[PDB]
Amino acid sequence: MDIRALYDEKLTTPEEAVSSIASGSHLSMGMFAAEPPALLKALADRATRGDIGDLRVYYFETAKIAGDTILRYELNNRIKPYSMFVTAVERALIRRGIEDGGRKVVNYVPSNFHQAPRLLAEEIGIDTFMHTVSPMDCHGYFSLGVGNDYSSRIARSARRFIVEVNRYMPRVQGEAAAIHISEVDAIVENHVPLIEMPVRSAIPEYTSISHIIADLVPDGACLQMGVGALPNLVCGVLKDRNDLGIHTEVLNPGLVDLIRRGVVTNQRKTLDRGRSVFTFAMGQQEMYEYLNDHPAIFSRPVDYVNDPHIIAQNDNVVSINATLQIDLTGACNSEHGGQLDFVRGAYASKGGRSIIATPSTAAKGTVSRIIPRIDGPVTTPRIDTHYIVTEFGAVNLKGLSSTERALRIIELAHPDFRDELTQAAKKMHLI
Amino acid sequence: MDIRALYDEKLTTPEEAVSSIASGSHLSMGMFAAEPPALLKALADRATRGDIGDLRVYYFETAKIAGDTILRYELNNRIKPYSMFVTAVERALIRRGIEDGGRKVVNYVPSNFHQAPRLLAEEIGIDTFMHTVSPMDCHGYFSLGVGNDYSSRIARSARRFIVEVNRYMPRVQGEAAAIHISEVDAIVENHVPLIEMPVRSAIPEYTSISHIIADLVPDGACLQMGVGALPNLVCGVLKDRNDLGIHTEVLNPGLVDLIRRGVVTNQRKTLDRGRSVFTFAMGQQEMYEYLNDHPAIFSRPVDYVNDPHIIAQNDNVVSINATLQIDLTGACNSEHGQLDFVRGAYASKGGRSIIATPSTAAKGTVSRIIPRIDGPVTTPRIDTHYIVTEFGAVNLKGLSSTERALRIIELAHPDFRDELTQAAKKMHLI
């Protein structure tokens, strides 16, 4: 009942906060900007001093904060990274491990992001959860801010929950987004700016792509949008629209701009009418500040947002994702869970469209991103692909034969490669 | 108003019935036993006479009926197979084509079985549909019998619907399973036994395997069982359970036996309480006869039955499917459809998806546990729940790549664990 008394009792230093984490246990943390830099530096220091060991850390969407501290290659023998998604940080480790006599240093845990809450809480189990939070409000609640995802579940299921208060973390309204002090085991404070998503340059091809994509977005569309230069530009094209909605996996600066412009009203959604729904947020300082106390933005846990069945309840969903390669069948590959939840959900939505877009080439036009056959596991299976788009147009693949697929996909390739690809298709018997 | 008058008006010969189908149009037909033999023979003949061309046929689960009629190789240029699953019949055509001068002769259409009704009705478009049906009842309705699937949907969407009345087709109750006479364009009669799935004999491993699986089936389970001896036999170890339910893609003999025995009450299901749900059926004459007018069996369309969200509604779902290979990561491969239930069972409260296979093939000489699947998979590794061989069961959910590989190598036959362990080390699955 005395919230200022509980806060003072629980408030401590980063060093002391992480000091009681058991060796040989399971720890998890928020995603990206949610990762708590002061707590993680102190924990990394505990390993450096040889005072903790055999600590498994299970997580998604790592940022420079985790990579610079606990995930640093030298602590790999004491803090074991159990990544459930592989980003730039793990790729760097993976390469280092290969060069060190094919040593294994990342313990990839295959999973569905939409199942993360259940996997972490039930099959795996998380003993300690750490997350950056907004400042306590006058009723005693902290907000997970940029993060909802699996965090709102694991913050509660973990045997200890440690928070890092940071005034740069927006106070976001959402389902289980708010956590009462009575539910927090320790508090440290570190007011420092949130980590930013790098702003990436627009290549020329995105212009034609954004216009091709934009023709495929109807009024009343309910947007889900990934990150990058391409989706931002698309958001740029949609500024003249009206009455759009948002139900997105990640909330990004392009989408927020449409909110700021009054383009997104959410009045045509079936679920969460009136509110922009997302499961975690990434962007730049201007966007992070804008989320603070916004009543028309509402974070929800990932097992809700990325449930394809939930997605489909909104009419006219448009899912826009990027990929690196598309093959002649055409399966798509985004590497070299998130996305796939929305491909399925958007197709299921009434009037819904799933769009996957890529420029037709890479490397100053020397490499085709339209290829004969993806190498190994794919991102988007060919049975799920709906609409693909390059600077040369768009194709809806649903119901097309293998031959019809190969022929139409080749026509989206750069002219320099159509002859080469046509030959490959006959050799593969796609014809 | 007068059904007897409408019937005689529409009744005709297979020849005349199919004589009007336009060249260059799209046709589809029921699955398996639903494939109308008289109508399809008559259609194949038009192609032989050279009286029809450029006809695309879109379908799933070919049966020797279509295999021996419209699908015969010599007609490939006139009746074009647009296959949405690839089974034994298409393999044979495809192999023959390669021998006929690297000629492309089968068109594969990638799809989700549970999207089949929409893909076919809306993306592809179907003009003529043909399906075997039970005899007209005294209210003027035929039944799709052993077929619902996408058949219920396309019978209505096609410009023309042609039925083959067969007294051997059971009269089955289900959603849209009954078709009024005013919804039918033409009728032919051909009373002949339905196609049977071959009965297959058990191999010894199924005995250990069935036990391991049985032990994973909780009180009041809601079953889906995959076609084949393995699932058929696990049904057998369940002769003793009580209050089981059925919500399955295919209704097979093993499941029907549990119904016959009173083991299945469906009283613990949340959806379709009291009724066994399936989307199409395959078995032998004894099972087909048993379905006739059964009030506790209810077919529903595949876009309902195979919707993972629907599957999950029922508590304690158990999905038992078989496969040919499991790799060390470990995805599964069923080829030389079911993914919906792998997803649905895991989502069910108390649900389990089980995929099982003997650990070896070729008299113990080939391991069915392999390092990495060659090409595209059936069940992806992020979706696999429980995998079973005669050496035990493992729940893969939440396991790391190392944890997956180590427990999986122990499910391989001992002759192979070392050879497999070394491959894993080389792949850095370690």
Side-chain angles (χ1 to χ4, degrees):
Chain A
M1 175 100 82
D2 190 7
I3 67 174
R4 283 175 298 186
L6 294 182
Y7 196 96
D8 298 339
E9 180 226 295
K10 291 162 192 289
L11 179 66
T12 186
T13 60
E15 178 179 73
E16 202 291 319
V18 304
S19 71
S20 322
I21 296 170
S23 196
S25 68
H26 296 168
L27 181 134
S28 186
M29 55 183 172
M31 304 174 44
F32 203 59
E35 301 176 341
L39 291 175
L40 292 174
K41 176 180 174 292
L43 183 49
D45 293 355
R46 246 185 91 195
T48 301
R49 298 192 308 267
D51 183 53
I52 189 168
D54 195 28
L55 182 68
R56 291 189 200 186
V57 176
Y58 291 91
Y59 67 100
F60 283 86
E61 209 56 32
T62 189
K64 184 169 173 161
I65 297 155
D68 285 354
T69 59
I70 58 156
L71 299 190
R72 283 202 314 276
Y73 191 89
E74 317 89 65
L75 307 138
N76 202 269
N77 64 317
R78 289 180 176 277
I79 300 176
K80 313 303 190 176
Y82 275 61
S83 321
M84 301 176 78
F85 207 39
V86 174
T87 82
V89 176
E90 290 77 23
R91 287 197 295 271
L93 292 144
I94 297 296
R95 285 183 299 260
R96 269 143 175 172
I98 295 169
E99 79 174 33
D100 289 345
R103 184 178 74 118
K104 187 178 52 74
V105 296
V106 174
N107 307 254
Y108 178 66
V109 182
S111 76
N112 269 288
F113 183 48
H114 74 272
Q115 297 165 347
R118 174 192 174 173
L119 290 179
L120 288 163
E122 292 176 21
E123 273 93 342
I124 299 165
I126 297 300
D127 303 287
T128 304
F129 192 69
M130 315 203 297
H131 202 286
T132 304
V133 298
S134 61
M136 188 180 74
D137 65 23
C138 38
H139 301 94
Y141 291 91
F142 304 90
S143 172
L144 296 175
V146 286
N148 197 305
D149 46 276
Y150 58 83
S151 292
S152 62
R153 169 93 180 258
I154 303 310
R156 275 110 165 159
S157 79
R159 192 178 179 277
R160 297 291 149 188
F161 178 37
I162 301 178
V163 126
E164 176 160 328
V165 169
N166 183 355
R167 64 172 168 90
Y168 290 86
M169 182 63 80
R171 185 178 281 105
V172 166
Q173 297 170 14
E175 174 180 13
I179 315 200
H180 193 256
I181 192 165
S182 66
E183 261 171 325
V184 171
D185 292 283
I187 305 161
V188 309
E189 297 168 334
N190 187 46
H191 309 290
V192 64
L194 300 187
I195 195 182
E196 295 188 337
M197 189 132 60
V199 206
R200 287 279 190 76
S201 315
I203 56 186
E205 296 116 312
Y206 287 168
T207 296
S208 165
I209 299 176
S210 63
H211 286 91
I212 293 158
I213 291 178
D215 284 350
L216 295 167
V217 182
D219 283 325
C222 185
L223 302 178
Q224 172 266 335
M225 214 147 304
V227 293
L230 179 49
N232 286 0
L233 250 61
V234 173
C235 292
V237 178
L238 300 184
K239 41 166 38 185
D240 300 315
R241 298 285 191 280
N242 283 283
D243 283 313
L244 301 188
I246 289 174
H247 178 109
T248 185
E249 182 194 2
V250 69
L251 186 65
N252 65 80
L255 284 182
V256 162
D257 184 71
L258 299 180
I259 296 178
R260 183 181 301 116
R261 291 175 177 269
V263 171
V264 167
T265 74
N266 292 292
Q267 289 308 315
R268 312 272 184 92
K269 298 208 301 184
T270 295
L271 302 185
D272 308 287
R273 183 174 282 119
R275 294 183 181 277
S276 294
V277 165
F278 71 103
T279 206
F280 79 102
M282 296 192 288
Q284 301 88 40
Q285 181 165 252
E286 194 195 38
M287 182 200 81
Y288 296 130
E289 292 166 352
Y290 186 77
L291 310 181
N292 192 66
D293 285 317
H294 200 306
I297 294 171
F298 195 77
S299 69
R300 300 196 62 167
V302 62
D303 54 316
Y304 173 88
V305 171
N306 282 50
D307 183 342
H309 172 75
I310 291 298
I311 292 156
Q313 304 306 305
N314 292 318
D315 286 3
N316 300 305
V317 165
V318 176
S319 164
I320 301 157
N321 288 337
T323 192
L324 294 179
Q325 308 174 306
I326 304 179
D327 76 17
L328 295 174
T329 70
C332 306
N333 179 36
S334 321
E335 83 195 355
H336 37 310
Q339 166 165 325
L340 187 59
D341 299 327
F342 275 91
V343 165
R344 293 168 323 192
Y347 186 67
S349 169
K350 170 184 178 248
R353 296 185 176 131
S354 158
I355 295 159
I356 291 173
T358 177
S360 69
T361 70
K364 256 200 185 174
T366 67
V367 174
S368 184
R369 289 183 174 282
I370 304 303
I371 67 172
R373 188 212 298 155
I374 287 158
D375 186 18
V378 79
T379 300
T380 303
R382 71 168 97 106
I383 55 180
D384 291 308
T385 314
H386 189 194
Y387 268 86
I388 50 170
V389 171
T390 73
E391 71 269 26
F392 300 111
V395 181
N396 175 359
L397 302 178
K398 292 285 188 183
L400 264 46
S401 65
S402 289
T403 301
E404 293 167 303
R405 290 181 115 109
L407 293 189
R408 294 242 43 186
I409 287 169
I410 287 165
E411 297 313 295
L412 294 191
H414 192 250
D416 294 349
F417 297 97
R418 295 190 196 166
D419 282 347
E420 187 168 346
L421 290 169
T422 299
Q423 286 314 300
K426 294 183 297 165
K427 178 137 186 285
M428 294 171 97
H429 293 297
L430 297 174
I431 288 312
Chain B
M1 266 292 251
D2 189 28
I3 63 171
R4 185 163 276 186
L6 286 135
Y7 193 96
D8 298 322
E9 186 170 304
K10 283 158 174 195
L11 177 68
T12 77
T13 37
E15 183 176 299
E16 190 277 333
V18 315
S19 74
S20 285
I21 303 169
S23 283
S25 64
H26 294 176
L27 182 134
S28 187
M29 57 186 176
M31 306 177 62
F32 205 59
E35 292 176 347
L39 289 178
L40 294 174
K41 172 170 168 59
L43 184 47
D45 288 348
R46 273 195 72 191
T48 299
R49 291 199 295 276
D51 184 54
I52 189 168
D54 190 38
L55 181 69
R56 297 191 179 186
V57 174
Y58 290 86
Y59 63 99
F60 281 84
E61 212 65 10
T62 45
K64 176 183 178 193
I65 294 171
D68 294 358
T69 51
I70 47 162
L71 302 185
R72 289 199 311 270
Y73 190 101
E74 59 273 5
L75 302 81
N76 248 19
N77 293 293
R78 298 184 159 274
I79 298 180
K80 298 221 188 62
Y82 274 74
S83 192
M84 300 173 78
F85 197 38
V86 172
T87 74
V89 169
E90 290 77 26
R91 296 198 295 276
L93 283 180
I94 291 165
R95 187 106 184 161
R96 179 132 173 232
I98 294 313
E99 143 185 341
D100 203 89
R103 198 177 125 250
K104 174 161 80 47
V105 293
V106 169
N107 298 258
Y108 175 67
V109 177
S111 78
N112 287 294
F113 184 39
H114 59 285
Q115 294 171 340
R118 171 185 179 179
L119 278 160
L120 293 161
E122 299 162 39
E123 307 275 5
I124 291 160
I126 296 296
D127 307 292
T128 304
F129 193 67
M130 313 199 303
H131 200 288
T132 306
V133 301
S134 62
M136 187 179 74
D137 66 32
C138 64
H139 295 287
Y141 291 85
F142 305 89
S143 165
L144 296 176
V146 304
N148 200 310
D149 44 277
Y150 57 85
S151 292
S152 43
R153 171 89 185 265
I154 305 308
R156 273 90 173 184
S157 63
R159 54 177 179 74
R160 292 297 183 236
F161 180 31
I162 309 168
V163 295
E164 177 157 329
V165 167
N166 183 349
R167 65 175 177 255
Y168 284 85
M169 181 67 79
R171 182 169 167 224
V172 171
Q173 304 169 30
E175 179 183 5
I179 308 285
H180 191 240
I181 186 167
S182 62
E183 271 183 303
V184 170
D185 292 280
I187 303 162
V188 308
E189 295 171 353
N190 187 38
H191 308 295
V192 292
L194 297 187
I195 303 301
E196 303 186 332
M197 180 158 54
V199 172
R200 186 134 283 107
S201 31
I203 52 100
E205 292 94 300
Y206 293 173
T207 293
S208 185
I209 289 174
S210 81
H211 292 156
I212 299 148
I213 289 171
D215 284 344
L216 294 178
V217 188
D219 210 24
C222 187
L223 308 170
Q224 171 262 348
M225 299 289 335
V227 163
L230 186 158
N232 185 285
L233 195 138
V234 154
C235 276
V237 177
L238 303 177
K239 34 190 209 300
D240 60 18
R241 301 298 174 268
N242 64 34
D243 304 287
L244 300 191
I246 286 172
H247 178 109
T248 191
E249 180 195 47
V250 187
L251 186 63
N252 55 63
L255 282 179
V256 163
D257 186 74
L258 297 175
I259 291 177
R260 218 181 279 97
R261 288 176 174 265
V263 171
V264 171
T265 71
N266 288 298
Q267 291 304 327
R268 312 268 181 96
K269 294 168 50 180
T270 297
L271 303 180
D272 311 284
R273 191 167 241 117
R275 278 168 346 196
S276 294
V277 164
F278 71 103
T279 207
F280 76 107
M282 299 187 290
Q284 298 83 38
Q285 181 187 85
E286 177 172 10
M287 186 196 91
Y288 296 131
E289 280 188 0
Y290 183 75
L291 306 181
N292 194 58
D293 285 322
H294 199 304
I297 299 180
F298 194 78
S299 70
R300 302 201 61 169
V302 65
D303 55 317
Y304 173 87
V305 173
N306 280 57
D307 183 345
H309 173 252
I310 287 302
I311 294 156
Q313 295 300 82
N314 296 315
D315 295 349
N316 299 306
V317 166
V318 173
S319 159
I320 303 169
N321 288 318
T323 57
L324 300 180
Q325 316 176 295
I326 303 179
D327 74 19
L328 291 182
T329 69
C332 303
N333 177 37
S334 293
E335 281 280 87
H336 48 262
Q338 57 165 44
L339 183 51
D340 298 327
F341 281 89
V342 166
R343 291 168 57 201
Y346 184 68
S348 169
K349 188 180 159 72
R352 291 190 171 151
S353 160
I354 294 193
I355 293 168
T357 174
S359 65
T360 63
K363 289 166 277 196
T365 62
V366 170
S367 183
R368 286 228 183 119
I369 305 303
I370 65 177
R372 66 176 294 186
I373 284 79
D374 182 353
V377 310
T378 299
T379 294
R381 66 165 163 185
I382 61 182
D383 291 315
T384 309
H385 191 193
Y386 271 100
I387 57 160
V388 171
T389 71
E390 69 271 24
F391 294 104
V394 185
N395 180 356
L396 298 179
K397 289 286 188 179
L399 295 174
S400 71
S401 274
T402 295
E403 291 170 319
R404 288 183 120 110
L406 294 214
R407 296 182 178 71
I408 286 175
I409 61 112
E410 296 303 302
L411 289 197
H413 186 289
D415 291 347
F416 295 100
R417 294 181 194 165
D418 304 301
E419 182 187 341
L420 286 166
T421 298
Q422 177 50 50
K425 285 178 41 199
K426 182 182 174 65
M427 298 169 62
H428 300 135
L429 287 180
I430 283 264

